[PDB]
């Protein structure tokens, strides 16, 4: 069995819809739902946790004073189930704030470290869903990268654009986020790491097996 954290940006900017089209939030939710549906249908043994960042509430083991705010553990590590599908589909909504992505990653790693203690997992994995529109502190990257490698946690990113034609009007913050994603994934697995960054559209096409 594996352990997977779905680390989903639900911050305010995720709710923006281009001309009524689907917002990044709805696109990310659809990818998460297709993944969870396949896991449940197959009776997979993998355990799935869900961390949301950008929530109006704060609920996580690291939260103190003004640290790790607006990050919430929606589902601790366990088998996915029909309750989770209903919650992701019909309960989870966008927040009205932004949270720091790297703090959400730290919360996700800490959750995996704590909740896999004394258990046997083949792999530990974190999947990030975001549009990279909000700021983060680049200095804490060194510790995060080191801890990911020590813990043998692998990463995937799911975005509304490629990390490599017509430009998409990306903000300077989104471009900085792109550089951060490339830095993390390259440190973790070189050039192959960069191929673990996907668009929502590509992921939906791969995962849309129920029709």
């Amino acid at each position: 069995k594996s352990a997977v954290v779905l680390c989903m940006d639900v911050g305010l900017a995720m709710s923006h819809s281009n001309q009524g089209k689907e917002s990044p939030f709805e696109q990310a939710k659809k990818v998460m739902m297709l993944f969870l549906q396949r896991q449940v249908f197959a009776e997979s043994k993998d355990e799935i946790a869900v961390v949301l960042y950008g929530t109006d509430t704060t609920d996580n083991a690291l939260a103190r004073e003004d640290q790790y705010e607006n990050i919430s553990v929606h589902r601790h590590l366990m088998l996915p189930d029909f309750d989770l599908l209903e919650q992701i589909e019909n309960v989870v909504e966008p927040g009205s704030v932004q949270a720091d992505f790297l703090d959400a990653l730290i919360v996700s790693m800490d959750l995996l470290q704590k909740e896999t203690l004394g258990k046997k997992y083949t792999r530990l994995h974190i999947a990030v869903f975001s549009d990279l529109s909000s700021p983060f502190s680049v200095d804490q990257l060194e510790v995060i990268i080191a801890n990911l490698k020590k813990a043998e946690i692998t990463l995937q990113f799911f975005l509304p654009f490629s990390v490599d034609g017509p430009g998409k009007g990306l903000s300077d913050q989104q471009k900085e986020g792109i550089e951060m994603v490339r830095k993390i994934m390259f440190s973790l697995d070189g050039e192959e790491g960069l191929s673990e960054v996907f668009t929502f559209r590509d992921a939906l096409e791969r995962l849309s097996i129920f029709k």
Binding site: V4, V31, H125, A127, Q156, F158, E196, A203, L207
Partner: peptide, 5 residues
Amino acid sequence: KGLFM
């Protein structure tokens, strides 16, 4: 890999 595992 990952979610496509």
